[PDB]
Amino acid sequence: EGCLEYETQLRRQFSLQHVRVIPGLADADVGGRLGIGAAHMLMSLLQPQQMLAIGFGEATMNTLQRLSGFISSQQIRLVTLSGGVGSYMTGIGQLNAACSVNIIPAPLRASSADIARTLKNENCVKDVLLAAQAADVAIVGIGAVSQQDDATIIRSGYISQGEQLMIGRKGAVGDILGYFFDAKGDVVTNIKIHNELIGLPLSALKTIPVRVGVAGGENKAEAIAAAMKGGYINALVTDQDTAAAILRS
Amino acid sequence: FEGCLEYETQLRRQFSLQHVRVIPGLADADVGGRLGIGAAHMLMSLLQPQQMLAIGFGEATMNTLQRLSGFISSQQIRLVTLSGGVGSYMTGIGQLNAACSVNIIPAPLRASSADIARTLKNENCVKDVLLAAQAADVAIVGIGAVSQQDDATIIRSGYISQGEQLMIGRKGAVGDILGYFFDAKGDVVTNIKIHNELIGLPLSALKTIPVRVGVAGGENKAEAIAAAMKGGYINALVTDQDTAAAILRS
Ligand SMILES: CC(=O)C(O)(O)[C@@H](O)COP(=O)(O)O
Ligand SMILES: CC(=O)C(O)(O)[C@@H](O)COP(=O)(O)O
Numbered sequence: 001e002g003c004l005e006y007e008t009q010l011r012r013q014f015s016l017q018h019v020r021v022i023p024g025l026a027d028a029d030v031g032g033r034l035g036i037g038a039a040h041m042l043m044s045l046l047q048p049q050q051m052l053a054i055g056f057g058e059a060t061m062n063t064l065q066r067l068s069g070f071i072s073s074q075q076i077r078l079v080t081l082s083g084g085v086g087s088y089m090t091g092i093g094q095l096n097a098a099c100s101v102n103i104i105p106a107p108l109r110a111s112s113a114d115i116a117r118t119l120k121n122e123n124c125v126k127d128v129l130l131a132a133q134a135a136d137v138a139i140v141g142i143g144a145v146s147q148q149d150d151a152t153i154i155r156s157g158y159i160s161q162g163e164q165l166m167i168g169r170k171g172a173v174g175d176i177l178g179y180f181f182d183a184k185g186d187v188v189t190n191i192k193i194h195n196e197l198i199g200l201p202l203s204a205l206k207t208i209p210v211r212v213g214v215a216g217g218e219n220k221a222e223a224i225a226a227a228m229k230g231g232y233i234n235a236l237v238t239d240q241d242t243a244a245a246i247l248r249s
Numbered sequence: 250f251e252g253c254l255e256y257e258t259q260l261r262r263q264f265s266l267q268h269v270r271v272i273p274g275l276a277d278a279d280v281g282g283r284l285g286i287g288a289a290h291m292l293m294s295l296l297q298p299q300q301m302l303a304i305g306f307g308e309a310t311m312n313t314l315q316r317l318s319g320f321i322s323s324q325q326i327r328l329v330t331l332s333g334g335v336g337s338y339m340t341g342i343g344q345l346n347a348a349c350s351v352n353i354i355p356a357p358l359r360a361s362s363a364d365i366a367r368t369l370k371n372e373n374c375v376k377d378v379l380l381a382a383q384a385a386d387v388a389i390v391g392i393g394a395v396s397q398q399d400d401a402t403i404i405r406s407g408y409i410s411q412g413e414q415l416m417i418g419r420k421g422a423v424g425d426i427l428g429y430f431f432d433a434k435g436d437v438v439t440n441i442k443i444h445n446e447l448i449g450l451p452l453s454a455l456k457t458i459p460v461r462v463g464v465a466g467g468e469n470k471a472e473a474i475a476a477a478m479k480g481g482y483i484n485a486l487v488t489d490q491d492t493a494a495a496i497l498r499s
Contacts, residue, residue, distance in 0.1 A: 085335050085355035091345035101343075103336030105357040107374040115368055122365070124357045128336075 006243040010236060013247065014228040017210065017235055018045070024239025030216050035062035038139060038214040038237040043070050045137055045210055049098075051077040053132045055140030055177055056084050056108060057152045059214040061092075063139055068093035075099050079132045081140065082177045082199030083119075084108030087156065104128045106198040108178060109158050113195035120198060132200050138208045140233065142215040143175040144223035153178065159193060167191060174223025176202060176213075176232050183222065185230025202232050210235060221245035256493040260486060263497065264478035267460070267485055268295070274490035280466045285312030288389065288464040288487040293320050295460060295485075296387055301327040303382050304338075305390030305427055306358060306449075307402045309464040311340040313389060318344050327352070329382045331390065332427050332449030333369075334358030337406070354378045356448045358428065359408055363445035370448065382450050388458045390483070392465040393425045394473035403428065409443060417441060424473025426452060426463075426482050433472065435480025452482050460485060471495035 006021040022037045024030055042063070046052060052071075054060055071078070072095045080088060083106035095101065105124050110116040119125055143151050145168045153159055158178065159167075172180035172188050178197045181187045187194070187202055205211065213233035215224050218241055225246050227233055238246070253271040260269045272280070272287045288309070296302060302321075304310055321328065327350035330338060338353060345351070355374050360366040369375055393401050395418045403409055408428065409417075422430035422438045429444060429452045431437045437444070437452055455461065463483035465474050468491055475496050477483050488496070 083355065086351065086353040089339070090342060090351045090353065091347040091349050092343070093347075094344040096343075101336060101339050103339070105333065105335040105355065107355040107372060111372055115372070118365055118368070122357065122361060 002240055006240060006247070009247055010243060014225075014236075016228070018212070019235060020237045021243045022216075022237070022239045024216060024241045024243075030239055031058065031062060034059055034214055034216050034237060034239065035066050038063040038212060039066035039070070041212060041235065041237055042067055042137065042139060045212075046074065046076055048074040049077070050136040051079060051131075051134070053079050053081050053135035053138040053208060054088075055138070056082045056087060057141040057143070059141040060139050061088075063214055064089070065093055068095065071095045072097055072099055078102065079128065079135055080104045080199070081132050081138065081205065082108055082197070084158075102128050102131055104132075104199060108198060109193065109196050110198060111196070113192070116196045116198060125198065129200060133204045133207050135208050136210065138205060138211040140176055140205075140211065140213055142213050142220060142224050142227050142233075144217075144220040145172050145174060145180070146219045146222065147217070163193065167193075173226050174220070176227060177205070181226055181230055181232075183226050185226045185228070185232070187230075202230075205232060212237065214238075216242045218242055218245050221249055225249055253490055253493070256490065256497065259497055260493060264475075264486075265484075266478065268462075269485060270487045271493040272487075272489050280489045281308065281312055284309055284464055284466050284487060284489065285316045288313040288462065289316035289320075291462060291485070291487055292317060292387065292389060295462075296320075296324065296326055298324045299327070300386040301329060301381075301384070303329050303331050303385035303388040303458060305388070306332045306334050306337070307391035307393070309391040309466075310389050313464055314341055315344060322346050322348060325350075329378065329385055330354045330449070331382050331388065331455065332358050332447070334408075334449075352378050352381050354382075354448060358448065359443060359446050360448060361446070363442070366446045366448060375448065379450055383454050383457050385458050386460065388455060388461045390426050390455075390461070390463055392463050392470060392473050392477050392483075394470040395423055395430070396469040396472065397467075413443065417443075423476050424470070426477060427455070431476055431480055431482075433476050435476045435478070435482070437480075452480070456481055462487065464488075466492045468492060468495050472499060475499040
C-alpha cells in the first residue's frame with residue numbers, strides 16, 4: 001500500500017500525532033470516502049462522554065453524518081467551533097441519551113467588526129465559545145484560495161469573489177473557520193473578514209489537544225501543508241493524490 | 250350535556266376559529282405527550298405537500314414536531330423558525346431527513362439591548378429568514394402564561410428573570426406568544442423592554458400566515474389562551490378538556 005508509506009512520511013514531516021491516507025486512486029467518490037475515513041479516526045480517538053468540537057463546511061458535515069450512531073451510543077457531546085447555524089446540523093441524524101448539542105446562535109460572519117464584537121460579548125455566544133475551546137477533539141475542514149470558485153466559502157456567499165482575489169494577493173493560501181493563512185501557516189494580518197467572524201480564533205482552536213483536519217483534492221495541497229506548518233491541526237485525513245502533492249510542495 | 254365534541258363546537262364559535270381539537274382528560278396519561286399527538290394529527294390534515302410550516306419556541310411545539318417528522322419527510326414540508334433561540338431548536342429539528350429545507354434564524358431569542366436587536370434584525374441572514382417565516386402557509390406556536398410563574402418555559406430557559414415576570418404581571422399581561430406579552434383583551438402590552446429585544450417575527454406579522462395553530466394545555470393557561478384567540482394571534486387551537494372548560498368560563 002502506497003497509503004501506509006504516505007501516512008508515515010506525512011506523519012514524520014509534519015510531526016503529526018495521527019494520519020490516515022485513503023486510496024484516492026482513481027475512484028470518483030472521494031468526498032464520501034473522506035468522511036468515512038475521518039469518522040473511523042474519530043471513533044478511535046474519542047472516549048465515551050468526551051466533547052467533540054465541529055467546524056464549518058462539507059467534509060466536516062459529511063463526517064458528522066457517518067459518526068451519528070457512535071455519537072449517541074458513546075454519549076459524545078458536540079459543540080460548534082463557528083457561527084453559521086443552519087449550515088450545521090439541521091437534521092444531521094439525531095443522537096441522545098445525555099448527548100448535548102451546543103450551537104453558536106449567530107451567523108458565521110457579521111457585516112462589521114463592531115457587530116462581530118457585540119455578538120461575541122452576548123452571553124449565549126460567550127458561553128458556547130468557552131465550551132468549544134474546552135473540547136477534547138476538534139474536526140475541521142480546510143479551504144484553499146486556489147479552489148477559487150469551487151470553494152465552500154464562496155459558494156455559501158460568506159465572501160465575495162473580489163474578497164477572495166485580494167485575500168490571495170495578500171499571500172493567503174488557505175483557511176480554517178474562515179481564517180486565512182499564508183504558505184508558512186501564519187494568519188494573514190490585514191484581512192477584514194477576520195474581525196467579522198463570530199467563532200473561535202485559530203489561536204484558541206490550538207487549546208484543543210487533538211485537532212483533525214479532513215481535506216482532499218490536489219488544489220488543496222498547499223493549503224493543507226500550511227495548516228500543518230501553522231499547527232492548527234495535528235492529525236490529517238486526506239487521499240493519496242493529495243498526499244503526494246503535499247509532500248512535493 | 251358537555252364533553253369534548255361540544256367544547257370544540259363552543260370554542261369554534263366563541264372565538265371564530267377555523268379548526269379546534271379538544272383531547273379528553275384522563276387519569277395520568279401525560280397531556281404534553283397527548284397534546285403533541287393531537288396537534289401533529291391536526292397539522293397532518295392541514296398541510297399539503299411542499300407547503301411551508303413556521304415553528305414557534307417551547308415544549309408543546311417541540312413535542313409536536315417530533316411526532317410530525319415522518320410526515321414532514323414524506324410530504325416534503327419546508328420548515329422555518331419564527332424566533333431566534335437556535336440550539337433549543339434541536340429536539341425537534343433533530344431526528345430529520347435530510348431531504349429537508351430547514352430555515353433557522355441564526356440568532357438568539359433575545360438580545361441584551363434594543364439596539365443590538367435592531368442590528369441583528371437587519372443582518373441579511375436574519376432578514377431573509379424573517380421574510381420567509383412571514384410567508385409560511387401554516388404556523389404552530391405555544392402559549393405561555395404569567396400564572397405559571399417559575400414553571401413557565403421562558404423562566405426555566407433563562408430568557409427573562411423572575412423580577413421581569415413580576416413586573417410584566419403588574420403591567421397587565423396575562424400571557425405570551427413568542428415572548429410577546431399581551432393583556433386579557435389580547436392587546437400587546439406597551440411598556441415592556443423584552444419586546445424590543447426579541448429577534449423573531451412580531452405578532453402583527455405572525456397574523457399574515459393564514460392558518461395559525463396554538464397548542465397549549467393546563468388550567469393555569471386558560472386566561473392566556475383566551476386572550477391569544479381574542480388577539481387573533483391564533484385561529485386554530487389544540488388543548489385538553491379541563492383547559493377548554495376553564496377557557497369557556499373566561
Ligand atoms: C469556510 C471554511 O471554514 C473552510 O475552511 O473554508 C471550509 O469550508 C473548508 O471545508 P470544505 O472544503 O470541506 O467545505
Ligand atoms: C418563550 C415562548 O415563546 C413561549 O410562548 O412562552 C412558549 O415557551 C410557551 O409554550 P410552552 O409552555 O409549550 O413552552
